[PDB]
Design a protein around this nucleic acid. Structure first.
Ligand SMILES: [Mg+2]
Ligand SMILES: [Zn+2]
Lengths: 221, 147, 170, 110, 56, 55, 94, 14, 1112
DNA sequence: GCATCCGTGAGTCGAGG
DNA sequence: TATAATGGGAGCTGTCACGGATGC
RNA sequence: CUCGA
């Protein structure tokens, strides 16, 4: 029930490295060249640093600041570019009638190149959640019909099926294969993620995409 | 994004990437007025090709093209959008020479003219919807009924 | 740049409901001025509009009743709160304003994450949607309490954090 | 004269011209005040007979944009100039009475 | 114990099962009780709370 | 009528002259003591229109 | 959240259609001084004054509440515009 | 490129 | 109260004069106290020497200059909005070579701004500061070619705008190229012009491996220096007729002319040290005996070849090393602008010498001083480095004077500033603070001089070190440049010493920045103090060693934004610098010598010194600083008091008995509180308001002019049309508000009438006029009123009238009136608070006292800070402070805890035990035992492992107290917080960011000229900008009508906005918008570019958006 | 077919002056 | 309205990525 | 330009 511990564990405040710097050691530091100093700070913030340790840490702190500062502008610029390239894209109709689609893989080649291994849960979710099945899928004695919007439970089911070897990829409607002019159709887009239900016709999904991609731009290190 | 612990759905990135693959390059004009090496929209060349095919002509041989978001944005059909983006001079000169007509399809063009954007409540799919109470509706239905 | 707009320092407002914000009385008096003039004419507060306006021109001439009138003016209406940089659509949200004494805007804690806003000096702009159409759009599509899940990921964006999590965990 | 494009902070920040209000075009408030004035004046004029209201309008220029002489209005209604002047006077008198009664036009006098 | 992830999942499930009105009310309840309990919890920060482990 | 399109094109000398309400012949702006627009200059009311409404 | 927002969203094929309906209805109410309301006297939205409960001045609130009753009809091409205008003017003059 | 230089050259011709 | 100080490091030297970087620099530039004939060839003297003589009367020469006394004193200059300046006279003589005639005269050149005692200027009434600029030092550099590994670039850099940058490179084809003004040409040619033969170059550069063969060109050696010279002139000046004397003039002016080319003394020195040569002057070559003579080129080429080959003792240069970056201080910058102005003056002089009578020319006739005055005025008014002085508090001014900028004229253009320029270089140690820099785009580009640092005469920054000989530390202090420092092994200041001998066998040191463990035998020097590493601001943060640098940056920066309070206190925990800051900032008044205080007043202190002389010190009272904060001095002595030299006479703003007082010492509790301190928000007690803590005085200045117009004169008067006695109540007879009147928004400060514009009354106005029978007045109300959200008490009026003594306004202006309005600002919800450790937050809630958490003795806390603001910020200093604060609260004492030499945990534990005895022993004496609630909390604490089970309640409570924690009762319930809470004294400041200055709202208001869009800014009653991204947000919501409304009715649609306002005041719904005016503007501006933009309907038929108004 | 010179972008809002 | 007069004078330059004519 | 988020 220690304060730092409770805050870190609950998710209220703090991560392991910050806690470590408070209680353990400050650790290794970089030179202004990116090169790392051989001698780490053995002191924590509790114990207090020496002036030399503080000065050595300043290089890294400053580099971090300059990095952030230079990152916000490139991120804003990128966002404006994305907005200008996507702005006309709107959900204009219910269904373009395409029979084209993409296949989202549930497995990926390992770096060992030994075989294929199941992709991470979050990745599969980010590729499947709220999407419309482009073909009938039959797994674990369950029918997932063509035209079905994949709920999170459907995704988890598909993951289970993949683990049992019943499926390696999922046929899905996608903006990539949508044949709607100047936009996408409802089926190829899938869920309005903010409402966990099919997207309303008229939604400016291009703008939403640009913002969705641009927003975490300043978190990318 | 995954590396940074950011959760982002694939379909947004797919929207953008689809915008990056919007254009093609002519490898052979065929029975068309197009030129070899001419860059145009995939949609337009496919429409042209189905038109020539339905006419019994030779379709246009085209190669897929990839371009970055900047160039794709500048290569758009709408001169207002492009000019308001950047390279204003270039865009305006080419559009002026071509006598280009902006059909106000997207959001920026409409924003510039202060029009109602073709999205949300301004979508053609919803903005013509009417509302009427049953009293008024019946009072109208009787007027229709007597004529 | 736009009319019917303002800005001020933001404050926490824990007591507020998800769909509410705290709007300073004087800010509201300026932002909703024509509505207030009309309403003041409707009641006995002023003979006509011009008299009401001249009356609001000097602070020492402003009497208590005009505040009550103001309360009737804002009833059911929403304002838009905006924090720059506006990185995604949730950098603008609609809220039903509650009039407060003081000069700070009160912002709900659960919406902070979306506006990337905290209380170390942050400021926020306020805008008044005028027409019935703009108000309908704001109350239906942009209301904070109707926008709980992220458009980017589909995950909850309005959710417990900080002290809230701390208490519940405890 | 000085340039409207003189920079205030730096070239990428602000221009002197940005700080200069347009004094020519009427504000929304002014326009609405003029509108309410016209409406209230018509309201007050409706309490008169058509001839006295019309005589007042012609004599003050609310019709064709210009104020006619007593001879022009008189010739228009087919009466003596003295007659039309007397009609204008009784019209004004009634307006003053009604105004003293309702006080609806005072606030527009600034 | 209720923490960030379980509370997030609770909010999402509540959204799915009950709709946004009820979910909004749930959010305000969680807010109120969370603040209330955090107040009297006893959570604070002193220099001795930054515990150096001997192992170090 | 409703605006549906916006075209942009080169302007011919004749088109430009069709736009014009008069030629600006003098590099003058306003008069140094009356502060009124000079004749045939960049602010001439003869060309560009009246400074005051209906006057 | 707006009372019954989930049901309202359930009533339309697109949320924006809901917004359009609510807005146009609000305008209809404002144009006819609420005399054309489909709400019974007990269903009328109220606002607490200094004196007491009065009618809610907010026409959007009214519109949404009316929409929740099912007594309103919406869709495209229900009636020529001018005919609607004239009939509503006849039933409830301004 | 420089109009003054150009003019001084053209002048230098006579 | 007693002040206990910790630490064992004995500072050998005190801090230098903290503003000397300004004062000494300007003093050096002016040389005003130096009799003319003794002046050095530096500063403005050097400027004169460069400009004169002016030849082709035939000669105008300079003898000397003098500076007179200021025509007006500083305060008067602040009042009348004048520049504080001194008249400059130059003694010139005109000589005709043929006639031999000599005319001599002293000519007036205008005025030069003088620096005040504190290092600042007064320019047009406002205090300004010339910020020092960091740049690359002049000299000869060698860097690795980024394209060709193994190849190097030589760069000869002179002073800014004192010659072009010249580059020497070895081309892929082997030839050695020279680049000047972006022109690549074979260096061999220039070498030939300099008078070098193939023999000399062969014997001089033959050692290197074949490089010299890229230098060998027969066609160049086959021609004498003249032909080579003309060839070069053709290679550099295409089109220009290759005349001999023109080539000579151009090349001389490019390479040899000292009036045009100038390495600094620093550049000369560096070139000499690097190339191992000696320069006669500061140019690259000379013109001696009709020919050119080399000085720098051959040695530079020699070094370049040697470095390329691999010859030992040759290295590239780190350009960010502080031995290669120097500081241009105010003296140098001003001198540069002075030099420019003088050059223009000289051109004017020659121009006048060509004209006029040739026999009747005096120096006065030839000299027009206008361009010089213009250059000076331009420098002090509109230069980038000339900044509006920050004087929110004295520390603000002090810090502002010690700032260093990499930007500015001749400096780095931003976004071309990569990570390198912004980095903390190893050589910054002791010279430039690694902490104090802005957040955001300016990071690393604006910095601060370290506390012990001094800029030397060459402009390089130096830091002090102590000499160490045989493990013995002397009191001999040496100030070194970074270049010098790189030669030695330098021990840390905290190295254990017994007497003057190093007591450890392993000592921590630096060698070229690299940390290394050495024996005392190896130690050559030792740091003076930890203080020397950081700026003055960072040196004010106690327990700095426990704070992460990112938050230290914030606390440091935020100290400058602190507002002087009416009851300001020095911190309970200080670093020991708080007195020097007050003294050096010239805030407070100190006794000049020993003596006795004769008179003490709120306005003045009279002191009788030992000499017997009576010195009267007037006290500045309720004066307005640049930022509107109060500047006043309070007497701190009493009548008859005996004072010694340097003793305090009066406390300035933010000063408590000579100690820097940037805020308040408040009792804080570290705990969450009902969401009111969520995400950095802060909860405070109403008790703070009750006893005027965080109350600050602010003065605003309002101004109004009455001028002559073509329609009649404006005038200040009380006779304002159509206003009641109620509205004119506080106006005096002349139409100016009275002293002492309370003014509110809408109230008139100064009455003014203006003759109406030529009114053609609309028929409505005519009819209404007839109805009410009142003549429309000739003049109208144009009075100065209190703006929305402002007001207070009128404290001063100033009236300047034309036709009155000492008064002459700008042309047409009849009179100017100024009204000063003071307000006493209490802390409110939304005001920004901060501590020195980077903890900041706005007040979110002000609680009544009975709601505050309180100690068992009934004492309520003042401030509640959230613990969640600590772990991820890693600024534990604020915690330690709090602990010490706790002790200090019960012992009634203050502490000096030096950075890196501060109090340690055990000592704080001792003090907390001592304080516990006072806190609890008193209770047990008063006849009270332990409380039930305390027992409950103790049970919980036992569960938390905070106290040892088995001990008595007192022993456990004592353990908690030693952990800095106490039992706290909830004021609302009387029940204890379930855990013990960290409580203690903390120093918190109120920052200048007050919500009163920030709240702003607009319905309608002024619009712009061309765009017809609302103006921006609170002052113009402006509207918020709804930018591209906000638009994107609305688009993403599908809020089409809201957006269109923003685009049209709300901004730039004239018919739309008018109709919208009218509809709303009528209670009708707003109408459908139409075309935004800025689109019409766009169309017209495209037409002006000869482009035809046409709005068409679906049938491709034109639609007129100008409604026929623009079609003939 | 491949190095060279030129023109152009480089986050937001807000504040002061 | 007439002695004769005849080719200027600025110029510190620490970023980066792309489309382009080009032009090596 | 400097400051703020
Ligand atoms: Mg913040
Ligand atoms: Zn589709």
């Amino acid at each position: 029930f220690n304060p730092l511990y409770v805050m870190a564990q609950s998710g209220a405040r703090g991560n392991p490295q910050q806690i470590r710097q408070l209680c353990g050691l400050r650790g290794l530091m970089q030179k202004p060249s990116g090169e790392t100093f051989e001698v780490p700070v053995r002191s924590s913030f509790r114990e207090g640093l020496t002036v030399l340790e503080y000065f050595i840490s300043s290089h890294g702190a400053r580099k971090g600041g300059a990095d952030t500062a230079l990152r916000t502008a490139d991120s804003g610029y990128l966002t404006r570019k994305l907005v200008d390239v996507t702005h006309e894209i709107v959900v204009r109709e219910a269904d373009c009638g395409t029979t084209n689609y993409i296949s989202v893989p549930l497995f990926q080649p390992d770096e060992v190149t030994r075989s294929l291994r199941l992709r991470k849960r979050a990745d599969i979710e980010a590729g499947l959640y709220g999407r419309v099945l482009a073909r009938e899928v039959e797994v674990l004695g369950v029918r997932l019909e063509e035209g079905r919007y994949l709920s999170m439970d459907d995704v988890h089911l598909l993951i289970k099926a993949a683990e049992a070897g019943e499926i390696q990829e999922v046929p899905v409607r996608s903006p990539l294969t949508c044949q709607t002019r100047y936009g996408v159709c409802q089926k190829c887009y899938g869920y309005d993620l903010s409402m966990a239900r099919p997207v309303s016709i008229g939604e400016a999904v291009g703008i939403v995409a640009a913002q969705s991609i641009g927003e975490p731009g300043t978190q990318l290190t | 994004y995954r590396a940074q612990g950011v959760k982002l759905h694939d379909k947004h990135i797919e929207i953008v990437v689809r915008q990056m693959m919007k254009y093609v390059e002519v490898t052979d004009p065929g029975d068309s007025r197009l030129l070899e090496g001419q860059v145009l929209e995939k949609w337009d060349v496919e429409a042209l090709n189905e038109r020539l095919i339905a006419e019994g002509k030779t379709p246009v041989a085209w190669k897929p093209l990839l371009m970055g978001v900047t160039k794709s944005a500048l290569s758009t059909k709408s001169w207002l959008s492009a000019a308001s983006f950047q390279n204003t001079t270039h865009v305006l000169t080419e559009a002026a020479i071509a006598g280009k007509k902006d059909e106000l399809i997207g959001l920026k063009e409409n924003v510039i003219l202060g029009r109602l954007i073709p999205a949300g409540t301004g979508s053609d799919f919803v903005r013509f919807t009417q509302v009427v109470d049953q009293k008024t509706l019946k009072a109208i239905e009787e007027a229709r009924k007597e004529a | 740049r736009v009319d019917y707009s303002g800005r001020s320092v933001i404050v926490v407002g824990p007591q507020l409901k998800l769909h509410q914000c705290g709007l300073p009385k004087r800010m509201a008096l300026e932002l909703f001025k024509p509505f207030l003039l009309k309403k003041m004419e409707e009641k006995g507060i002023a003979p006509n509009v011009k008299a009401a306006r001249r009356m609001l021109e000097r602070q020492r001439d402003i009497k208590d009743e005009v505040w009550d009138a103001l309360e009737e003016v804002i009833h059911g209406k929403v304002v838009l709160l905006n924090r720059a940089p506006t990185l995604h659509r949730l950098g603008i949200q609609a809220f039903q304003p509650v009039l407060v004494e003081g000069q700070s805007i009160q912002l709900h804690p659960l919406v902070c994450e979306a506006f990337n806003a905290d209380f170390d000096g942050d400021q926020m702009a306020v805008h008044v949607p005028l027409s019935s159409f703009a108000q309908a759009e704001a109350r239906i599509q942009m209301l904070s309490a109707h926008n709980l899940l992220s458009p980017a990921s589909g995950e909850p964006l309005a959710k417990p954090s900080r002290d809230i999590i701390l208490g519940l965990y405890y | 004269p000085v340039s409207l494009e003189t920079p205030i902070g730096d070239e990428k920040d602000s221009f002197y011209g940005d700080f200069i209000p347009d004094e020519h075009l009427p504000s929304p408030v002014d326009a609405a005040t003029q509108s309410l004035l016209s409406e209230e004046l018509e309201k007050a004029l409706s309490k008169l007979s058509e001839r006295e209201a019309m005589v007042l309008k012609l004599r003050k220029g609310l019709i064709d944009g210009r104020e006619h002489t007593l001879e022009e209005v008189g010739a228009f209604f087919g009466v003596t100039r003295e007659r039309i002047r007397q009609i204008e006077n009784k019209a004004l008198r009634k307006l003053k009475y009604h105004e003293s009664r309702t006080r609806k036009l005072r606030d527009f006098l600034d | 114990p209720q923490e960030k992830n379980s509370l997030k999942d609770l909010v999402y499930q509540a959204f799915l099962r009950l709709g946004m009105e009820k979910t909004a009310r749930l959010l305000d309840a969680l807010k109120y009780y969370g603040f209330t309990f955090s107040t009297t919890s006893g959570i604070t920060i002193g220099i001795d709370d930054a515990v150096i482990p001997e192992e170090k | 009528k409703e605006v549906r399109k916006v075209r942009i094109a080169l302007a011919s000398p004749e088109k430009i002259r069709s736009w014009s309400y008069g030629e600006v012949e003098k590099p003058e702006t306003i008069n140094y003591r009356t502060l009124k627009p000079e004749r045939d200059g960049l602010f001439d009311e003869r060309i560009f229109g009246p400074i005051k409404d209906y006057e | 959240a707006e009372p019954g927002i989930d049901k309202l969203f359930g009533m339309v094929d697109s949320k924006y259609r809901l917004t359009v309906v609510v807005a146009k209805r609000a305008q209809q109410l404002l144009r006819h001084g609420f005399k054309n309301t489909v709400l019974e006297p007990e269903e009328r939205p109220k606002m607490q004054t200094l004196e007491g409960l009065f009618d809610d001045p907010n026409a959007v609130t009214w519109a949404m509440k009316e929409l929740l009753t099912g007594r309103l009809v919406f869709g495209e091409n229900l009636v020529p515009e001018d005919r609607l205008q004239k009939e509503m003017e006849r039933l409830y003059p301004v | 490129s420089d109009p003054v230089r150009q003019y001084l050259h053209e002048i230098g011709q006579v | 109260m007693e002040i206990k100080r910790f630490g064992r490091i004995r500072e050998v030297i005190p801090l230098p004069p903290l503003t000397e970087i300004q004062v000494e620099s300007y003093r050096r530039a002016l040389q005003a106290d130096v009799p003319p004939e003794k002046r050095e060839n530096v500063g403005i003297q050097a400027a004169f020497r460069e400009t004169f003589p002016i030849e082709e009367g035939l000669v105008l020469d300079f003898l000397e200059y003098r500076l007179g006394e200021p025509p007006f004193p500083q305060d008067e200059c602040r009042e009348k909005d004048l520049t504080y300046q001194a008249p400059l006279y130059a003694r010139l003589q005109l000589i005709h070579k043929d006639t031999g005639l000599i005319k001599e005269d002293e000519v007036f050149l205008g005025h030069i701004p003088l620096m005040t005692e504190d290092g600042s200027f007064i320019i047009n009434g406002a205090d300004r500061v010339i910020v020092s600029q960091i740049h690359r030092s002049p000299g000869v550099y060698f860097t690795p070619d980024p394209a060709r590994p193994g190849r190097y670039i030589a760069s000869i850099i002179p002073l800014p705008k004192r010659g072009p940058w010249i580059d020497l490179e070895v081309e892929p084809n082997g030839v050695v190229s020279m680049k000047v003004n972006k022109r690549k040409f074979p260096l061999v040619l220039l070498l030939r012009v300099l008078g070098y033969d193939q023999e000399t170059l062969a014997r001089e550069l033959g050692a290197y491996g074949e490089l010299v063969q890229g230098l060998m060109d027969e066609s160049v050696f086959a021609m004498r220096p003249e032909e080579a010279l003309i060839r070069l002139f053709t290679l550099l000046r295409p089109g220009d007729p290759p005349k001999r004397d023109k080539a000579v003039a151009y090349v001389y002016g490019l390479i040899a002319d000292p009036r045009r080319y100038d390495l600094g003394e620093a550049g000369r020195y560096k070139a000499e040290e690097k190339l191992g040569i000696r320069l006669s002057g500061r140019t690259l070559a000379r013109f001696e005996d009709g020919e050119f003579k080399d000085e720098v080129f051959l040695p530079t080429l020699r070094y370049l070849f040697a470095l390329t080959a691999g010859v030992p003792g040759h290295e590239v240069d780190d350009i960010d090393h502080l031995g290669n970056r120097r500081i241009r201080t105010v003296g140098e910058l001003m001198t540069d602008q002075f030099r420019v102005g003088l050059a223009r003056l000289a051109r004017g002089v020659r121009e006048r010498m060509l004209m006029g009578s040739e026999d009747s020319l005096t120096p006065a006739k030839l000299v027009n001083s206008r361009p010089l005055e213009a250059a000076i005025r331009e420098f002090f008014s509109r230069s980038q480095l000339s900044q509006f002085k920050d004087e929110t508090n004295p520390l603000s001014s002090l810090r502002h004077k010690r700032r260093i900028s990499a930007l500015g004229p001749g400096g780095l253009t931003r976004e071309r500033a990569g990570f390198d320029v912004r980095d903390v270089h190893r050589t910054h140690y002791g010279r430039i603070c690694p902490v104090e820099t802005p957040e955001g785009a300016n990071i690393g580009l604006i910095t601060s001089l370290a506390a012990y640092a001094r800029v030397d005469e060459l402009g390089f920054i130096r830091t002090p070190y102590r000499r160490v000989v045989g493990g013995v530390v002397t009191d001999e202090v040496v100030y070194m440049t970074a270049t010098e420092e790189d030669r030695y092994t330098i021990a840390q200041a905290n190295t254990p010493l017994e007497g003057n001998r190093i007591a450890a066998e392993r000592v921590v040191a630096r060698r070229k920045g690299e940390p290394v463990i050495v024996s005392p035998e190896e130690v050559e020097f030792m740091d003076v103090s930890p203080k020397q590493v950081f700026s003055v601001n960072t040196n004010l943060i106690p327990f700095l060693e426990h704070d992460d640098a990112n938050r230290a940056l914030m606390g440091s920066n935020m100290q400058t934004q602190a507002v002087p309070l009416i009851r300001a206190q020095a911190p309970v925990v200080m670093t020991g610098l708080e007195e020097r800051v007050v003294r050096d900032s010239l805030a407070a008044l100190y006794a000049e010598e020993d003596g006795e205080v004769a008179k003490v007043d709120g306005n003045r202190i009279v002191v009788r010194y030992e000499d017997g002389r009576l010195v009267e010190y007037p006290l500045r009272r309720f004066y307005r600083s640049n930022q509107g904060t109060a500047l006043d001095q309070r007497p701190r002595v009493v009548v008859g008091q005996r004072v010694r030299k340097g003793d305090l006479l009066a406390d300035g703003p933010a000063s408590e008995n000579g100690f820097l007082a940037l805020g308040q010492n408040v009792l804080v509790a570290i705990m969450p509180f009902d969401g009111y301190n969520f995400e950095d928000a802060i909860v405070i007690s109403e008790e703070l308001l009750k006893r005027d803590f965080y109350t600050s005085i602010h003065i605003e200045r309002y101004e109004i002019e009455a001028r002559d117009t073509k329609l009649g004169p404006e005038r200040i008067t009380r006779d304002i049309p159509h206003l009641s006695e109620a509205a004119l109540r506080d106006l005096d007879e002349e139409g100016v508000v009275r002293i002492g009147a309370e003014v509110k928004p809408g109230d008139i400060l100064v009455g003014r009438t203006s003759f109406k514009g030529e009114s053609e009354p609309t028929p409505e106005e005519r009819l209404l006029r007839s109805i009410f029978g009142e003549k429309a007045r000739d003049v109208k109300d144009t009075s100065l009123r209190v703006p929305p959200g402002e007001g207070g008490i009128v404290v001063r009026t100033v009236r300047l009238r034309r036709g009155d003594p000492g008064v002459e306004l700008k042309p047409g202006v009849r009179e100017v009136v100024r009204v000063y309005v003071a307000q006493k600002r209490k802390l409110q919800v939304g005001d920004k608070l901060a501590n020195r450790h980077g903890n900041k937050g706005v007040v979110a809630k002000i609680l009544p006292v009975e709601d505050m958490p309180h100690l068992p003795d009934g004492t309520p806390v003042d401030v509640i800070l959230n613990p969640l603001g600590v772990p991820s910020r890693m600024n534990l200093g604020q915690i330690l402070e709090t602990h010490l604060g706790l002790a200090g609260y019960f012992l009634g004492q203050r502490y000096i805890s030096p950075i890196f030499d501060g109090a340690k945990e055990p000592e704080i534990k001792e003090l907390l035990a001592q304080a516990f005895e006072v806190y609890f022993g008193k209770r047990k004496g008063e006849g009270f035992g332990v409380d039930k609630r305390e027992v409950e909390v103790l049970r919980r604490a036992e569960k938390l492992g905070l106290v040892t089970p088995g001990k008595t309640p007192e022993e456990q409570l004592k353990e908690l107290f030693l952990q800095g924690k106490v039992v706290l009762y909830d004021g609302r319930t009387g029940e204890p917080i379930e855990g013990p809470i960290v409580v203690g004294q903390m120093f918190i400041m109120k920052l200048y960011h007050m919500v009163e200055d920030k709240m702003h709202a607009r319905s309608t208001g002024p619009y712009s000229l061309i765009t017809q869009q609302p103006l921006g800014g609170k002052a113009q009653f402006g509207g918020q900008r709804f930018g591209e991204m906000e638009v994107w947000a609305l688009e993403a919501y599908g809020a089409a009508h809201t957006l269109q409304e923003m685009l049209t009715l709300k901004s730039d649609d004239i018919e739309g906005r008018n109709a919208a306002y009218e509809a709303i005041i009528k209670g009708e719904d707003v109408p459908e918008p139409s075309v935004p005016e800025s689109f019409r503007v766009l169309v017209k501006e495209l037409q002006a570019l000869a482009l035809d933009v046409q709005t068409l309907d679906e049938k491709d038929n034109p639609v007129d958006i100008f409604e026929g108004l623009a079609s003939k």
